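Ticket opened by: R.M.
Priority: normal
Category: complex prediction / small molecule

The reporter submitted a protein together with palmitic acid and asked that the result be attached to this ticket for the collaborator who will pick it up next week. Submitted input follows.
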Amino acid sequence: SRSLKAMGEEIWKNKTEKINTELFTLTYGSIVAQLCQDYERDFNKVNDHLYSMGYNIGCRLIEDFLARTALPRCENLVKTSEVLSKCAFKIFLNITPNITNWSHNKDTFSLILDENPLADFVELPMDAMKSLWYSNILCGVLKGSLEMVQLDCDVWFVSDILRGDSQTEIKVKLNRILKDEIPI
Amino acid sequence: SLRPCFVSLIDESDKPILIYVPNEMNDVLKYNVLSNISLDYFESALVEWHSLDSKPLLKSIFQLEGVSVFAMLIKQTGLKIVIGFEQKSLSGADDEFEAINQIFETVRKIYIRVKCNPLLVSGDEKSIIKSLERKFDELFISTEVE
Amino acid sequence: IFENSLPKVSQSVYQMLLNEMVPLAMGIERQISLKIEEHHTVDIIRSHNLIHELYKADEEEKEKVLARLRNIGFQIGLKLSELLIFSNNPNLKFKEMDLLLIMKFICRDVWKQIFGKQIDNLKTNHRGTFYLLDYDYRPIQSFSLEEDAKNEELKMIEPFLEIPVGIIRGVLSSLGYSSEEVICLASFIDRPTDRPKTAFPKGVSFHVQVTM
Amino acid sequence: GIYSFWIFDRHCNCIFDREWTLASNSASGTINSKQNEEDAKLLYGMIFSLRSITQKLSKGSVKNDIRSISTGKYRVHTYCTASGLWFVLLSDFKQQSYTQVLQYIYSHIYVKYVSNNLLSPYDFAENENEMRGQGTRKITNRNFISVLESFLAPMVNQ
Amino acid sequence: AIETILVINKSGGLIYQRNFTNDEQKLNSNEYLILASTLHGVFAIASQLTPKALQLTQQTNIENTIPYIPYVGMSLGSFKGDDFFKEPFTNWNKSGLRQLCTDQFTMFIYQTLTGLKFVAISSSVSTSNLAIQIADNFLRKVYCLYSDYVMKDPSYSMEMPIRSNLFDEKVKKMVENLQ
Ligand SMILES: *C(=O)CCCCCCCCCCCCCCC
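Result attached by the on-call engineer:
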């Protein structure tokens, strides 16, 4: 009924439970630091594992988002982007990414951020400039969650403040809205 | 509160499992001696036992080395429990006795529980003794700070 | 009122991220020894068969996974005093405060922050060691295998309980008592009667035994 | 009162089933009975076939969904979510608006105990041969059954 | 405001779907045929689904009767007087689908004894309990209009589309009085 911005502004202040953002950052940084320090210092096979982590988080977390908000099924990328960029992130991470870089005839979009709480004051060692993204759990969550609402897409970073870009950005390219299953 | 001075639990086969004391160095021997004497006090018709609703019955047995020894037996498990208290620290009130038998019931419950299977890698007797010592620290060496 | 004048993140996402790290530990161990993203595919076990495998794992396997998770928890607890919610606002310093007050801190404020509530009662002997209890223990209040499986539940769960022992065996370190000196083991224990019934079948305990 | 409770998922097979029959709270609660699997398929066929009508003859850009199906004897209340979970319930009359209850059943008794339940799995596909609509592995989450029965016992007034 | 009505002759198969909207005409004719067929399938499949609590004992043949409401229709042909019927009448589809509630509309059913089905789609969500009585009363009214103006007609084969004029221009006034 209400606009999706208000549906999210009126729930973040009313019915949630809250903690410290840089506490959450320290926890995530501890996890990814243990990933880096565990095995062979390799920055390629940590990316896929953080992607997998995010996949499990999102696949288990989508059920909560609908439960608290109760949106309908999303059909087109426009409404999907509006939803996940002005109510979902507002509920979870208290950030409001705005959309940019629509492609031809709306086959994809891109999220852009400058206040990512998954790593705020996390200027990192010089070694990480090639393979480690440090926020791969976010894109894992996006793909895993969106896989559960029947729309199939692949998500991946393009830019990040940490590796020395302007603002961080994620591409969300859709593949096919798979049909619902029939009993037969 | 009542502070037990030594606790001892024995099975049917007269096998000392645990003669734990709270915290002098050489008094552990004296508690061992008194526990064995209390074990001697049991197998006999010198004093009555049970025959009261088929329930266990706490009773004082003897006093030596300046510590009074209370004892208790379980008919349907073979469990033989005995605790000694500092003589000077016991006033002898009815409420005091009502606290002592409650202590006996509690320690019996803890031992019966710890004897159960779960969270035991192999049911090792060393681990069982260690756990029982830990819980007998819990019961009598607690303070409940705010 | 400075406590609430800082940004926040949802306790739901934080709790679930905190939860699925036993799956992280088992997964990283099995990677050490068909979903397409990058034209080479990535496989994964779906975060519950990993639990079931860790339950039916070998002894050395389980010990290694628990050590890894404990290392994670130690990293969580190391930087908790430099965290910018205790350094400035609350009026408890960190000069020395030998024992007692430090455990009051970790027991009262750290648990209120990391988990959703203040602790239940603790116990002390004043010599070296402290006992901590919690009857509900929020981050696992929704785990249950099956109706008449009231034995495998605790076995499957006890890997998760090795994180708060991590923070406890952490924050003592870097504030004055090191890992070799401090030993602490987390274990299960049933709740008292006069508490609501269907929170969890049992409470939980911690056995900090810093040597001094 | 309520006659029975059924949960379905996107893989078109019932997850949880519970019919009370007798008026008592602790009535013949044949929880996850194999006896009523035919009824489960039958009811899912009803709801799926009849959802298409309102899915077709919608207006605007709302893409609506059913709320209730009535008949001579009983009355059906359904909640359908973007996750594909259906929360069908068979009940009687003299309770006119009821969707609040199903939103409650989704809010903090399914996610609180079925999707915050790392021991238990998410929607029970298990790599083909069940996800098409014929196989069956059901939910048996002890907490879910216990708190669900406790919460729904007052609503079986008979 | 009943924005649409339609009918299903005896075994599925639409025969009349004059939709009383201002201007939508989104749904094509062939789609409504499949709609009616699946709706008849829902009636066929709904019978053997009742919960076991009531099947063994009904003890409820007092509520099946429908109360009468005086002037739901207007403000005639074979009938005369102010109104079609006054005596309180009885339900027939004792174990069939009756109502269908959604966010955007509400659909009511009246099943004739022989098998004719009358469907009424209204945008107005009538407290959803008395709405059944209102819908059944109005549906019997249009059913009487049908029995008058569709069957006392030579150029009308049985169970075929209703290509009438008096029927539609009369049910139009019938609905328009009901707002
Ligand atoms: C229409 O139904 C589409 C809904 C949009 C998908 C829901 C996205 C929720 C996940 C947001 C990210 C949460 C934080 C993850 C990192 C810990």
